[PDB]
Symmetry: D2
Subunit: 328 residues, 4 copies
């Protein structure tokens, strides 16, 4: 008699909260570990083109199962392992080098998405797509176009990380935890991001009202340097360690939490902003969105100054110029 | 007239003294996995990172700091100088040479003994009352080395040991039986490596002895070949190294688990590297994994496992092999 | 337009995915609710009771703590339409023991309550798992299974999960080890006829019975039988002191709910139909270690019992069957 | 030797101790919330009703397997309280039918006259977190009796009022309370002040978008949201007889910042002498930076002439009661 038969009496012979991570590099694995440690999924699937690395990463995670509450960890080059995922996170692709723009990655990662997106949609037609690969705003547009999904189920990580870094720096300046420091960085996840100085507050006390020179060139405290630091942060980290991983992994797990738990929390994520701020094109960029079980259900209509709105329009114009030049 | 002064009214001068400080030495794949795991388990109010590569260290620290909004650890610091390490309750050593494909952990001994000669005195200088958690390989020998250099009592010197081996064994057991590893009980003791001992007698699900049900358990004449489960545990690191170049996630999770018991004074039983002199006929200062009670003072107690003649012989072989290497140690 | 319309632009104009219902909002129901809420097990919590004021007050109190939780929807109502598409339905409704009263003395008045509750739950959540807490839990799990017409896998009684948790707490206190590291099983009836499996008692896989052969024997100088007697009497002791038990059972239920909602496939001592084991030929429900996941009880662990242990379980089983057939 | 000696070979103070004084509905909700948030390595409970206290402690202890707090203690004697980092006061007299305001406040002062010296004796370096009503007056009372610096004396104050306000705001807008920002300050209860200027979603000022916000000339009547905060509090009492879960969660949130030295901003009762023209030793809710030394800083909120007057009236009324009190 088998030991299993002697020990266990079987009564009877489909995952409810499945998450897939595409690309098991530094970003993909940081997302995976953060999601597993937050108990967001009952099943985790991993996909990559490098079969050895993929099997090794899956095994390393599986060896930690005793310390996790995610009972099934799967991987494969074939997308059948991704079937019936509630959320699919795309982190596959070329990463920006020291001093290189994220916009220089566009043709390399567009070609990667041309293969990935149809495979993901085939096995999880009702999933939400969470794009992380750079340039995140353009690649969210690309994923939306290739998938044919409604705009609500296509989300780019966007400025959730930029806003998180801004709040970290704000917190460091004021001696307050980032959770209690409120500030929004919108638009392009990159060089043309927009700091909304008007919305900056601690305990609902407007920083701009207290200090009218906030973010202007008149400012003796040079608060504009906080946003420069945000723009330059990725470049700085890339210069020091070769890539960024932990902060984005944590930012993704935060977005995944609101989606998986249907929290309806407000996050700055890449979404289609056509019809807002005089944008007439199919441009994707970060604006505050209500995140839940159906992805982006609503958009917060931020009151911007004429200067803030102009900066956002410049960001959108730059992104559309790149987007027009794409063939699918 | 600053914005800070206009917004905030200060009641007290900055009275900095961290109550639950953790330090990670070595910010490679292992150190960073340990750091992220500890950060996501809210085990510390302060995290300190040390390395010899200053750029990598600054980059890693910054990457973690950029995630502060999503964490509940208000202070993350780093530096080449151990003054950043001051008053840590727990210091985790992950610095050093790692095995290449097919290389024994025992081949790393001279290289990492050489670096421990520098690290251990620096950690003890700034955190004299800390608990030391050794991860660097060979973990059993390096726990002995850390204990000898520090001059600390044996309770405050802990090696990660077979906590990971036992965890991998339970994962495989669980997969074979269709039960969560949490409900599958089994112990891998001794050397964190090739000479680890599977305690077949203690293997159970719901207190039901697997050896009693299947007397062939762990033997060569076993039709089910359960001895292969332990073989898979021994090879696991080699197979992962072959595939991705190193191991990181499972060890970081295993370290965070040990840190949880220490920081929270849980008094949970873990298979960790400790001095086993006086047990199983071992007369020498050998460090190897045995089940220990882990709390706020590190290892407070040892579980005296009843072993079969075969099991005890295997453990004695492990201890003999480790002492032979320890004997020749120059430091 | 409205401030809401000026501030928020709507994109989308769905069935609950991880819904849990708690029936009965008394001390037990509310302890289960708070435990489940703090463990992030559900995206929707529904509450049902017959006392409408108490139900509204409890719902509101929970809703006022929403900022500190990650369960976005908390609903309540006397009508079971609020319960629709629940993955798990927890029954805590009914009469509780008075000081010195047996759980078996609640059977007839709690059977009548179930005759009304179970058809209403099955109507709105036909594919749910039923988790019975109301006493006598073993008999009422049988009752819920009979009324629902559900397969035995989707009908679970909280059973000896709490008895085993209390046993491990006491074991831990005696040994100076965390209950997590102290292993021991209390099986059978959640009550006076529960069975301590002395053979399975261990720390780090080291058998306590092997080390101390007198374990759970009358001769035993350390009197380890007293740990089990303390387990039997625990509810009686707490009832005498505070009037009822709530926190420990809430935590125990949340633990069972975690295995079910997350499909963990952990082993728990829960009330299930044991027909076919230990010479039991009747439709008796009692605690045995079960594998708990998304389909409830998928498997049963076949514990090796001594002739005395098996006889005690059979006596427990005989007592329960006698009551069951008379309903 | 003993089984313990045969099994375990021995080789060899609480670092994160929390005390809850008063094991009523509030105290027990605080206890369960703190236990489920892993904030302490030791939990101590104190009350005057010895049976209820022992029963509550036991019920919690029986759930030890599901928790990560290795030691739960209780007792009428404050020696169980020794070396607590945080002491939470939820103890209080149950108001009688006739009772005047001063009658009720003096009865609670009489309770504090006994509690506060006993807590300070066993935990001289602890932070005091006052929950007992009237929270503003009793925080002042605790500060006076203890002799502690104002940073180590905190009143739960308006944290619950703000939490309820955000819940209602969230329900109006279809946004999670975490993403709805709004502050209710001043006197906890009927005389609380909604700061309309600070109300926002994603940093978008609601007052800027809708200038009639919180005024009487508002078609949307947002003033009703604050009325509902003051109103829902009475609604819970009428419906279930007390409030527990929301305040328990609110207190655990405050405890988290203190224990983990987070330096998060909370609306808590503190001494506001020197602000808004207040010249007396009055305790009111303002946003404070909470960490390992309690209140280290405060946020200087810009208030309207009306908002400033309300706070001044509140402070004048509180001081009038405070000078006629026997200590
Ligand atoms: N805030 C952000 O949005 C943010 C932050 C950091 C990095 N990134 C981006 O994330 C991406 C990845 O970063 P990284 O550090 O992990 O790089 P990486 O080199 O570590 O990993 C990329 C992985 O993608 C895999 N891959 C390539 N083509 C694939 C395909 N067709 N299918 C499946 N997998 C494929 C590679 O094999 C590799 O494992 C980059 O585009 C980077 O710029 C975004
Ligand atoms: N016990 C276990 O279960 C287990 C599991 C996996 C790996 N390991 C071990 O952990 C160690 C590290 O693994 P890894 O993958 O992180 O290697 P790694 O090369 O990626 O990282 C090693 C780090 O140590 C640093 N370092 C070297 N000398 C130092 C010094 N004198 N002071 C401070 N830092 C110094 C390096 O600069 C480097 O960043 C190895 O010894 C490895 O075998 C143990
Ligand atoms: N380990 C265990 O299994 C365990 C432990 C503790 C208590 N219990 C049991 O749980 C049950 C409840 O305990 P309690 O302390 O919460 O009692 P309680 O009186 O405080 O609560 C019972 C609730 O059930 C409600 N109720 C009654 N009939 C109902 C109906 N037809 N539909 C909906 N709700 C109804 C009541 O109105 C009441 O609110 C008891 O049967 C008790 O013995 C079991
Ligand atoms: N600040 C808030 O937002 C808020 C919210 C809800 C309740 N409350 C207040 O909390 C207090 C308690 O509420 P409750 O529902 O728990 O009341 P309760 O009557 O149920 O509990 C009070 C407890 O205090 C105990 N007690 C009385 N005197 C004592 C003493 N000298 N030492 C130790 N314990 C003593 C009682 O025995 C009792 O157990 C009340 O003052 C209430 O108004 C405050
Ligand atoms: O939730 C709450 N419940 C309490 C209450 C309720 C209505 S007034 C006071 C509460 C608790 C227990 C008994 C109790 O008995 C009463 C009832 C009415 C009284 F006038 C005085 C005491 N009262 C205590 C309390 O402070 C709050 S919070 C709160 C109260 C009023 C307005 C706004 C807020 Cl946020």
């Amino acid at each position: 008699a088998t030991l299993k038969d002697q020990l266990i009496y079987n009564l009877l012979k489909t995952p409810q909260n499945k998450i897939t991570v595409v690309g098991v590099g530094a970003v993909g694995m940081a997302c995976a570990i953060s999601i597993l440690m937050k108990d967001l999924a009952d099943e985790l699937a991993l996909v990559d083109v490098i079969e050895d690395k993929l099997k090794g990463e899956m095994m390393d995670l599986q060896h930690g199962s005793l310390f996790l509450r995610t009972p099934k960890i799967v991987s494969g080059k074939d997308y059948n392992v991704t079937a019936n995922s509630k959320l699919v996170i795309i982190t596959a692709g070329a990463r920006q080098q020291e001093g290189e723009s994220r916009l220089n990655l566009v043709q390399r990662n567009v070609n990667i998405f041309k293969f990935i997106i149809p495979n993901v949609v085939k096995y999880s037609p009702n999933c939400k797509l969470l794009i992380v690969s750079n340039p995140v705003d353009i690649l969210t547009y690309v994923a939306w176009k290739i998938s044919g999904f409604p705009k609500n189920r296509v989300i780019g990580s966007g400025c959730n990380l930029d806003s998180a870094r801004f709040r970290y720096l704000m917190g460091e300046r004021l001696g307050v935890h980032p959770l209690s420091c409120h500030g929004w960085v919108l638009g392009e996840h990159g060089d043309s991001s927009v700091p909304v100085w008007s919305g900056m507050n601690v305990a609902g006390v407007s920083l701009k009202t207290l200090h009218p020179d906030l973010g202007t060139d008149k400012d003796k405290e040079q608060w504009k340097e906080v946003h420069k630091q945000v723009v330059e942060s990725a470049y700085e980290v890339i210069k020091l360690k070769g890539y960024t991983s932990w902060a984005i992994g944590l930012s993704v797990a935060d977005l995944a939490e609101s989606i998986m738990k249907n929290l309806r929390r407000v996050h700055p994520v890449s979404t289609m902003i056509k019809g807002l701020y005089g944008i007439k094109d199919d441009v994707f960029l970060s604006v505050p969105c209500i995140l839940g079980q159906n992805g982006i259900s609503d958009l917060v209509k931020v009151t911007l100054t004429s200067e803030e709105e102009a900066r956002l329009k410049k960001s959108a114009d730059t992104l559309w110029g790149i987007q027009k030049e794409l063939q699918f």
